[PDB]
Structures are given as C-alpha cells and as structure tokens.
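tool_call predict_complex ligand=calcium ion
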Amino acid sequence: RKLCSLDNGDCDQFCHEEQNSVVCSCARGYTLADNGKACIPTGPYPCGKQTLE
Amino acid sequence: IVGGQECKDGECPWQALLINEENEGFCGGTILSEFYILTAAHCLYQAKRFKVRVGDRNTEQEEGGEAVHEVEVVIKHNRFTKETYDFDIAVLRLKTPITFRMNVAPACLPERDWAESTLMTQKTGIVSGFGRTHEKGRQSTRLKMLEVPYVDRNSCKLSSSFIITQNMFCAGYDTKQEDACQGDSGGPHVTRFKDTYFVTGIVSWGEGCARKGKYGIYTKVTAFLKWIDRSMKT
Ligand SMILES: O=C1CN(S(=O)(=O)c2cc3ccc(Cl)cc3s2)CCN1Cc1cc2cnccc2n1CCO
Ligand SMILES: [Ca+2]
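tool_result ok
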C-alpha cells in the first residue's frame, strides 16, 4: 500500500504517481486547493454533486 | 429499474431523458455539460425524431424544474455494431444550453487510469432511469436509482450467451431481483467517490431483466474518454 494506492494518496479526486511521488488533480469545474490535495468548485453547480437547492 | 429506490429530490441531477415525437421517454442519458448529453448509440435507432428532457422525476405531473431541449447534432461512434452492441456510445449536442438548477447538474468525467484502478474497483456503482420496473412490466413514471455491485469480468463472460467485448463491463446481481431494464438504456451508470459522482458506464444491455445467472452490461466509458473529449469539441 504505497502512494496513490494508500487511501488515494490523500487526494480528493484524481491521483497520479510521478517520480515515486503523489500528484493530485481535479475534474473540469474544480481547482486544486492550496494543499495540493483538496478540490475546490470553480462556480455554481459543479459536476458530480447532488443539488441541495 | 427493477427493485432499487426512487431518486429523491436533487439526488440524480445528471439524468436526461430522450423523448419521441409523442412525448414518451424511450431511452436515458447523462448530462456531461451545458451543451452535451452522453447516451447509447443503439438508442438513436428508437426514433426518427427526438428531444432531450432534463430535470424530470415524475412524468405524471410538472414540478416546474423540467426543461426540454432540441438536439443540434448527433455524434455516433463510427464503429457501433448493432449485432453485438459493441461501441455502444453516442454524444448529443443541444441547440440551447442547459441551465443548471435543482435536479439539473452534470456528472463528472474521470481520467482513465485513476477511474479503472480506483473507481471501478469499488464495491458498487449507481444506475438510474425511467425504464421498466419488471421484465414484462410497464415503464416507470418515477425516476428510480439502484446500487449495482461491480461483477467479475470472468464470471460475467461465463454467464453470458453473447460476446462481452473490451468496450463493456458488467454489474448487478446473480439472483437478486434488482437490475436495469428496458427504457433505461443510454442512461447513467455512476460511481461515488468522496461525495462526488463520476460517469463510469452507459446502460447498454442484458438478457432480459434481473434474470438469475445474468448480469447488466454497460458500455465501458473509461475506454472512450478521448473519444468523448473530441466529440465535445465538434
Ligand atoms: O433480452 C434482451 C433485453 N433487452 S432490454 O431492452 O429489456 C434491456 C434489459 C437490460 C438489463 C440490464 C441493462 Cl444494464 C440494460 C438492459 S436493456 C435488450 C436486448 N435483449 C436481447 C439481446 C441482448 C443481446 C446482446 N448481444 C447480442 C444480441 C442480443 N440480444 C438479441 C438476441 O436476443
Ligand atoms: Ca415532472
């Protein structure tokens, strides 16, 4: 259990292993947070989210 | 959808419904963006003229969040074969953009490698639609959803009387009475990861519905991501 195989590498979404290191990324409509792990919605009604209002 | 549950308010916002000239749904779809719907290529053989309805949950009354959209261009995979259902994927571009609101939002398209290793290795996925509630049953007037476990590729190939190509995958139950059915085709198969849902399949086919020893067969979306991306730019 190493890198992206260890709990998705702590990434919210996409995980890529580069040079024996974890690199996180997000779906269109999202932007990677300052911690390079979390994914922040760019606007209203981001993909993959159930609507609450 | 056989078994399963009703999609509650705001639960299945990416569901689209292909309707014919007589206003009856005949296939499903997934909202990919404001201009694009993902569906099954074999559905484009179910009507000479059709439109797309989004935001619907009960075809028997109007909640007010529904919106009908006309199709501007139909993009069918050139390699689609009716005899076996191989390459069962199509993309639709709408004449007018979809205004996202309650019960109307797009599902996320994932990246191939990450999806196949992390999404598709999850226990379950979710399939939904207005299709039949029983094999010989009538279409549902309510949008339904059902959690379908991923099925071992070998066990599935063994169970099927027909060819399972590299462009398909299986999900469902061996004996349990839960599965997609007629009318759900073209509809969404999605997987949830940390409260975000990603497109992982397109309701394609099965031998009957919920039959013992038979599974539901879906188009392997992860195998067409580059194709989908190109279609959404033409
Ligand atoms: O028995 C059914 C059921 N319908 S259905 O519209 O009721 C569906 C049932 C079902 C069940 C699960 C999922 Cl995921 C999708 C669907 S579509 C599809 C076609 N068939 C027959 C069928 C499947 C199939 C697969 N490959 C080649 C030829 C095939 N035929 C025609 C010969 O019987
Ligand atoms: Ca309605």
